[PDB]
């Protein structure tokens, strides 16, 4: 089954009318005159076009048309073509000076455009060779929506071969909310469920997605679907893998098209065990986004350990290492402090199997060496405190020492 709609149905009966770009549109259209980015942009607009249309037909409500996004390559003409069937542009929009303009030209020696607005409006050609002048003529045979043809620069002819284009689409445009055909071959779309409302995402749907974003074969031991608009637009999903970890990677999205796939320092360093996905509508800022996500995660765990102390304990043995690096490698004491509220430790208050949290040691901090309750339960330094009043805290882990020393205190407590 081959299915694409892209062919030359157009002609310019009349004759074009050259224009000038405004004084500014020039000075960026020449500083520009990394590299694969532009299709991600062009796919975006071609969707956004279609969304704006769909949203307007249901308004009144006569049955929807075909709504696709197509991409065509030409080996012998050296071209690439993207035609959505969206709401389209009118003649005025065509002349009024908005991302995709500068990326298409960053690869094109010359762009060709066939737009036509949905309002039953004529169709127009739009030519430009990246110099200050763009012709625009009424054109015959234009199909509703917007075709974009690009005769690629001499040196950027790579995007002209199909074997090179597929990865760019699979990478960035795997979640566009309308069908997307490369050469009429349907390109996959998974559902971007991180956009949805946390209540409407079933449990089975999270799993299917965890299995994708993490390349795994199990379920997620925890799930966090953080959707909030107050600080920044975020539509996020977090998953912690179930079993014990043995040898960041949250993807980074903006309005369903990928920016960065292995987002480094989107999350802290001690949170590098989270997969899932952060999405925003905001394209140095990250040093604000990383800190605010850090808080929501710490929340989620402090409040898991409130929900179900057994699942948490299983997790804190599996992943307590990162939590320690968190406090040794974090520099600002309140962040270290807020991570310690996740540490659980064995202590004199119950037999082996007592995880006390330091937070609860507020009954009255002393701590001892490792690793077994026997070398702890008879240590001349321990028993010195067993004849003494205070309750000691038993670390039983070796890197716990450096954690609890680099965490130089807790809640202004000696530690
Ligand atoms: O990239 C394209 C292209 C390709 C195919 C198309 O078929 C269209 C098209 O006809 N569109 C109509 C739209 C209408 C709205 C829209 O959405 C974008 C503009 C409105 P926005 C926004 C504002 C600022 C930045 C981004 C979006 C939004 C953003 C995010 C989510 C939802 C809406 C909004 C906000 C509030 C109310 C109403 C609209 C996108 C639209 C795309 C454009 N180029 C590049 C060219 C270079 C040279 C020559 C020809 C070229 C064509």
From Swiss-Prot:
Lineage, opening ranks: Eukaryota, Metazoa, Chordata, Craniata, Vertebrata
Name of the gene this protein is made from: TRAP1
Phosphoserine, modified sites: 96
Tissue specificity remark: Found in skeletal muscle, liver, heart, brain, kidney, pancreas, lung, placenta and bladder. Expression is highly reduced in bladder cancer and renal cell carcinoma specimens compared to healthy tissues, but it is increased in other type of tumors.
Protein name: Heat shock protein 75 kDa, mitochondrial
GO biological process, one term: translational attenuation
Self-association state and partner proteins as the record states: Binds to the intracellular domain of tumor necrosis factor type 1 receptor. Binds to RB1. Interacts with SRC. Interacts with SDHA.
Binding site for ATP: 45, 84, 97, 101
Sample GO molecular function, one term: ATP hydrolysis activity
Annotated family: Belongs to the heat shock protein 90 family.
Subcellular location: Mitochondrion; Mitochondrion inner membrane; Mitochondrion matrix
Annotated keywords: Acetylation, ATP-binding, Chaperone, Membrane, Mitochondrion, Mitochondrion inner membrane, Nucleotide-binding, Phosphoprotein, Transit peptide
Residues of the full protein shown: 70 to 547 of 704
Regions that span the bilayer: none
């Amino acid at each position: 089954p081959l299915h694409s709609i892209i062919s030359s149905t157009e002609s310019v009966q009349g004759s074009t009318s050259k224009h000038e770009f405004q004084a500014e549109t020039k000075k960026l259209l020449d500083i520009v005159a990394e590299k694969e980015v532009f299709i991600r942009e062009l796919i975006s607009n071609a969707s956004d076009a279609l969304e704006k249309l769909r949203h307007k037909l249901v308004s009144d409500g006569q049955a929807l048309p075909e709504m696709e996004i197509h991409l065509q390559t030409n080996a012998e003409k050296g071209t690439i073509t993207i035609q959505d069937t969206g709401i389209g542009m009118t003649q005025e929009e065509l002349v009024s000076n908005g991302v995709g303009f500068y990326s298409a030209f960053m690869v094109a020696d010359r762009v060709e455009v066939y737009s036509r607005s949905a309002a039953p409006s004529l169709g127009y050609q739009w030519l430009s060779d990246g110099s200050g002048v763009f012709e625009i003529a009424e054109a015959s045979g234009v199909r509703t929506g917007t075709k974009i043809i690009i005769h690629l620069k001499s040196d950027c002819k790579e995007f002209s071969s199909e074997a090179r284009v597929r990865d760019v689409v699979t990478k960035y445009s795997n979640f566009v909310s309308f069908p997307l055909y490369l050469n009429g071959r349907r390109m996959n779309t998974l559902q971007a469920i991180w956009m949805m409302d946390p209540k409407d995402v079933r449990e089975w749907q999270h799993e299917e997605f965890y299995r994708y974003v993490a390349q795994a074969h199990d379920k997620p031991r925890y799930t966090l679907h953080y959707k909030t608009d107050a600080p920044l637009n975020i539509r996020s999903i977090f998953y912690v893998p179930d079993m014990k970890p043995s040898m960041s990677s949250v993807a980074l999205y903006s309005r369903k098209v990928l920016i960065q796939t292995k987002a480094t320092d989107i999350l802290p360093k001690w949170l590098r065990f989270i997969r899932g996905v952060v999405d925003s509508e905001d394209i140095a800022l990250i040093r604000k986004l990383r800190d605010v996500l850090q808080q929501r995660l710490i929340k989620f765990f402090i409040d898991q350990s409130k929900k179900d102390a057994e699942k948490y304990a299983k997790f804190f043995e599996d992943y307590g290492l990162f939590m320690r690096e968190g406090i040794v490698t974090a520099t600002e004491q309140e962040v270290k402090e807020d991570i310690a509220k996740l540490l659980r430790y064995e202590s004199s208050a119950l037999p082996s199997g007592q995880l006390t949290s330091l937070s609860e040691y507020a009954s009255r901090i002393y701590y001892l060496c490792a690793p077994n309750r026997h070398l702890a339960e008879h240590s001349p330094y321990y028993e010195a405190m067993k004849k003494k009043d205070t309750e000691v805290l038993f670390c039983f882990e070796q890197f716990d020492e450096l954690t609890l020393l680099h965490l130089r205190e807790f809640d202004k407590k000696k530690l």
